[PDB]
Amino acid sequence: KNRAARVRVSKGDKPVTYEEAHAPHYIAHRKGWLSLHTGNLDGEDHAAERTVEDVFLRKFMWGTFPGCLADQLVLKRRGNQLEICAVVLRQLSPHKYYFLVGYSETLLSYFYKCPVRLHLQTVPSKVVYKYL
Amino acid sequence: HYVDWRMWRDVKRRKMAYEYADERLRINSLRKNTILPKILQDVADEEIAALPRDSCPVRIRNRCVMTSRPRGVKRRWRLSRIVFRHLADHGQLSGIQRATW
Amino acid sequence: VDVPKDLTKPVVTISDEPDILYKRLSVLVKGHDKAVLDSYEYFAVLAAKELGISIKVHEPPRKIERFTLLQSVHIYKKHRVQYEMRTLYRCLELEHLTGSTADVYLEYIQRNLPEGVAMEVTKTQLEQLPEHIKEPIW
Amino acid sequence: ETYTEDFIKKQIEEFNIGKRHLANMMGEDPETFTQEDIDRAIAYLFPSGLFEKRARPVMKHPEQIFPRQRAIQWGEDGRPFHYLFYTGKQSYYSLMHDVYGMLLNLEKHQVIGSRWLIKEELEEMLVEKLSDLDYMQFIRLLEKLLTSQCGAAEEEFVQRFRRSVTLESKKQLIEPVQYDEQGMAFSKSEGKRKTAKAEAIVYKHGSGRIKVNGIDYQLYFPITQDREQLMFPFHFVDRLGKHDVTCTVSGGGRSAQAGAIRLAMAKALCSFVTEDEVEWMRQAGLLTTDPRVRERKKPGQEGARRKFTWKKR
RNA sequence: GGACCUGGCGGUGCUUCAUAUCCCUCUAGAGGAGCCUGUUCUGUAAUCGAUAAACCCCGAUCAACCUCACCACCUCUUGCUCAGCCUAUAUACCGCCAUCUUCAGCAAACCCUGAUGAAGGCUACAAAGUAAGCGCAAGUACCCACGUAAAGACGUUAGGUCAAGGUGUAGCCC
Ligand SMILES: [K+]
Ligand SMILES: [K+]
Ligand SMILES: [K+]
Ligand SMILES: [K+]
Ligand SMILES: [K+]
Ligand SMILES: [K+]
Ligand SMILES: [Mg+2]
Ligand SMILES: [Mg+2]
Ligand SMILES: [Mg+2]
Ligand SMILES: [Mg+2]
Ligand SMILES: [Mg+2]
Ligand SMILES: [Mg+2]
Ligand SMILES: [Mg+2]
Ligand SMILES: [Mg+2]
Ligand SMILES: [Mg+2]
Ligand SMILES: [Mg+2]
Ligand SMILES: [Mg+2]
Ligand SMILES: [Mg+2]
Ligand SMILES: [Mg+2]
Ligand SMILES: [Mg+2]
Ligand SMILES: [Mg+2]
Ligand SMILES: [Mg+2]
């Protein structure tokens, strides 16, 4: 039986998001990609470097906004601009979200030597697609 | 802070191979022709053999950069099949999807 | 009501140096998503028409790179997982535009290149014969 | 996820305001903005390449989006509105009661283009869930109603449960007859066999000459079976030595190229034969594109179908 | 010990079937020769894992050094790391899988039957079942609506993998 990236059926009490509810074979069919860049196009270079950067930013944001992320990050690269789009919860005070945005954008801009912007969308609670 | 001691040895091999690349390239040029005297090429053979063993680029191994797996690595992403699939199967590799045809 | 009264316009200076002439600009965009290329095509074509540039469009054949990987962490060789990367193309062909017009149009459409889309713009410049080649010295 | 009437009423107010916003975004008249324009604008503003269209961005009217919900079936006093409520299938059994009642009244008084609706379409007219045997029993009762001397009132009713099906004619299409600079009538067609692609020009009048990539057909096809394929279309309609052909073929092997030319010539030849002859060519297999193409090899097996040897145990 | 329920099993009955499939039938092979390659044995101071179906060009889309985890000898001790360990345990596990599956079943919550026992719950000219959800199906990919892919639940074999990585427990620390 296939296991990869499959949230398994339970008793009907486990809330899953839309991202979680779709196995890998639905990628490009029902669900899109969580990062968009040119490295994996034919004739393009530096796919390995974009992949390492993406893995770091996901770990970095998980621990920089601990308990606040309500879904996976969406990573967008245009030119040398890096856009991080995150769906977060509404528990932390707005002052802390502004501190962490200023801190994260600045720290990541100096780390990867590119202008980095963080876009936060807040939701009252994790959006539930279905109960498995 | 590298994944293991085996990745750390390969890191050092890549650094030393980079430092000796020009010297080895120049000495090899003397050995890779039929123009120069054998007396001169025999000395160049000994000179390149006397360089540090880990300066030799054939000892560099393409290991998985996140797990240090020495085989099953995809060169384009520098990841092992297991690590690559984990990212691909979660939709985190731009443009990569399951193939059906 | 709270509208600006006068607006400062960016300074565009006419030079004394002659302008570059491009016989053709072949803008080849590559992407994983056809709908994004369709939307970019619409934007890029509409931008050319407003600027008075002659533009033709076609879709080169797509490229699909497939590769195979083991499914299990250990053994079970006969069970594989196959992956692919789809590269789709749209080619915007612009003709008979000066170097100043090409700089504005390319900057306008390059800045608005969607995430995940690469562009290869091939520029064909018109040049006159070098003065040394006009006559034989011998 | 039940949806109340107040919820749908709010969703329609949002769609009408958003419909004017979307028209304002695209610089179009909000009054003449149709659903086809909405879909076009949403596809541009939110381009999605997802293969399944149902997963793509959509801005539809609430009636189209939300499922049909049955209204409450009893009032404040708790009395159900319909006398068949306690069956659990009041809509289905009310229909069976209405059809059974009509069959009785008739006694007291005394195909190609249409089909019966499927169970999933009846389940929407009734807004109830039905078994398969429930569907059959209802159809068996409607068929029993056609066999009777049903009048006009009993015919509008049966037509509600009939869905028009658009039969597609198998009649072969005919290419236009064109004329060259010299005024010679000719037709042009194309054919595909495996990876070979052919384009043939069949002239109305000729001596039987066939040129394949500028070469005589017997020099281009030295194998006699490839030449029999070229003979097959003309021989079948008794027109050997009556037409000139100039065709071009690329891709595939010698046999696939002969097949692609055979199909291209047969389609183009249909312009110069009678309609009855075109139907005989169709029924002889001369106008059908062969769909048989190489099957991909699968991983973990030796070929497209062959498996690796099952190792001796 | 008596009588039952459920499951398994029967060189168990009847009936109907299998569709590259059980027999017969069709085509090309293996089993014989040499060679290539894996494994087992034997050998070596000199790895490990897989190992009936479901191991055996298997982890390896790959070992002359390296890789390397093995052996012999020599050397270092806060050590690339706010150490390290391919040390034991896959019968503690996550992760990713094999297998039936070339299946269509799994099942919450209720309701009813059996005197309110383990348990059981269907007959359409219908007799107690209603069933969310999951799977199949449907959709999607490839050249169609075909085919092939993909998908394939709950469970089964304490199946495979602590040597991808991570990790519980135990153990090593000149
Ligand atoms: K039994
Ligand atoms: K044999
Ligand atoms: K053999
Ligand atoms: K396991
Ligand atoms: K492990
Ligand atoms: K362990
Ligand atoms: Mg499988
Ligand atoms: Mg090597
Ligand atoms: Mg074969
Ligand atoms: Mg057989
Ligand atoms: Mg043999
Ligand atoms: Mg062994
Ligand atoms: Mg063993
Ligand atoms: Mg074992
Ligand atoms: Mg050694
Ligand atoms: Mg060795
Ligand atoms: Mg050790
Ligand atoms: Mg186990
Ligand atoms: Mg299909
Ligand atoms: Mg399959
Ligand atoms: Mg399916
Ligand atoms: Mg075991």
The beta-carbon neighbor of B76 closest among A5, A34, A47 is: A47
Which single residue is written with the structure tokens 């006969």? C78
Q: How far apart are the first and last CA of chain D?
A: 56
**Residues in the 5 Å CB sphere of ion ligand 9:** D 303
Q: What is the rounded CA–CA span in Å between residue D151 and residue D137?
A: 22
Enter the DSSP assignment of B70: S
Per-domain boundaries in chain B? 1-91
Burial class (CB in 10 A: 0-12, 13-18, 19+), B77: buried
In a 3-state reduction of DSSP, which class is residue A107?
helix
Q: CA-to-C1' distance for D101 and E125, Å?
A: 18
User: Is the C-beta of residue D298 closer than 7 Å to nucleic acid chain E?
Assistant: yes
Angle of the D132-146 helix axis to the D153-160 helix axis, nearest 10: 150
Sheet holding D245-250, edge to edge: D178-179, D185-193, D196-203, D245-250, D210-212, D215-216
CA of A132 to the centre of ligand 21 (A): 19
C20 within 8 A of C125, measured Cβ to Cβ? yes
> Cα dist. A132→A14, A123, D193 in Å?
5, 22, 49
Q: What is the resolution of this structure in A?
A: 2.9
CB atoms closer than 10 angstroms to residue D253: 13
The DSSP string of D183-216 is --EEEEEEEEETTEEEEEEEESS-SS-EEETTEE
Q: How far apart are the first and last CA of chain B?
A: 43
> Cα dist. A32→A26, B93, D46 in Å?
9, 11, 13
**Protein CB footprint (7 Å) on chain E nucleotides:** 29, 49-50, 52-69, 80-82, 84-86, 95-100, 108, 124-126, 131-134, 139-156, 160-161, 163-166
Q: What is the rounded CA–CA span in Å between residue D244 and residue D65?
A: 59
Which single residue is written with the structure tokens 């022709």? B33
User: Is the C-beta of residue C66 closer than 7 Å to nucleic acid chain E?
Assistant: no
Q: How far apart are the first and last CA of chain A?
A: 18
Query: What single-letter amino acid sits at D83?
Result: Y
In a 3-state reduction of DSSP, which class is residue A103?
helix
State the DSSP H helix or E strand holding residue D217, giving kind and residue range, or none if neither: helix D217-220
- The shortest C-alpha distance from A95 to chain B (Å) reads 31
D271 within 8 A of D265, measured Cβ to Cβ? no
User: Is the C-beta of residue B79 closer than 7 Å to nucleic acid chain E?
Assistant: no
Tokens matching residue A113: 């030597």
- In angstroms and rounded to an integer, the radius of gyration of the C-alpha atoms of chain B is 20
Which single residue is written with the structure tokens 């989006």? D65
The DSSP string of A56-96 is HHHHHHHHHSTTTB-S--EEEEETTEEEEEEEEES-S-HHH
Q: How far apart are the first and last CA of chain C?
A: 76
The DSSP string of chain C is ----SS-PPPP-PPPSSPPPEEEEEEEEEEES-HHHHHHHHHHHHHHHHHHT-EEEEE-PPPEEEEEEEESSSSS-TT-EEEEEEEEEEEEEEEEEEEHHHHHHHHHHHHHTPPTT-EEEEEEEE--PPPGGGSS---
Enter the DSSP assignment of A31: B
Closest chain A residue by Cα to residue B77: A48
- The shortest C-alpha distance from B35 to chain A (Å) reads 39
Closest chain B residue by Cα to residue C64: B99
CA of B21 to the centre of ligand 18 (A): 49
- In this complex, the nucleotide whose C1' atom is nearest to the CA atom of residue D88 is E130
Return all residues near C95 (Cβ < 8 A) that are at least 6 apart: C23, C24, C25, C54, C55, C56
A119 within 8 A of A83, measured Cβ to Cβ? yes
Enter the DSSP assignment of D147: S
Neighbours of chain C (3+ CB pairs under 8 A): A, B, D
Neighbours of chain D (3+ CB pairs under 8 A): A, C
| Method of structure determination | cryo-EM
CB atoms closer than 10 angstroms to residue A88: 19
Closest CA to D167 of D111, D83, D245, D98: D111
Enter the DSSP assignment of B62: -
